[PDB]
Amino acid sequence: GSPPEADPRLIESLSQMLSMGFSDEGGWLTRLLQTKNYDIGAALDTIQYSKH
């Protein structure tokens, strides 16, 4: 699961996305987070939708 070697803020980058309204069907979200990192500011821009 989540070991003490994992940064509590690093894992929170995933939960933050879910609360933002970001969901995955095939699991492309977790894949995107591995290619474009957990950078919310970058991922949000990837789909243009930043406000509505």
Residue numbers at the binding site for a second copy (CB under 8 A): 25-28, 31-32, 34-35, 46-49
Judged by beta carbon, residue 4 or residue 27, the one nearer a second copy is 27
Q: Are 26 and 49 spatial neighbours (Cβ–Cβ below 8 Å)?
A: no
Rounded to a whole number of angstroms, the minimum distance from the CB of residue 48 to a second copy is 4
- Which is nearer to a second copy, 20 or 31 (by Cβ)? 31
Q: By the 8 A CB rule, do 32 and 44 touch?
A: no
**What DSSP string describes 7-25?**
-HHHHHHHHHHHHHT---S
Instruction: Kindly state the smallest distance separating residue 8's Cβ from a second copy, in Å.
Output: 25
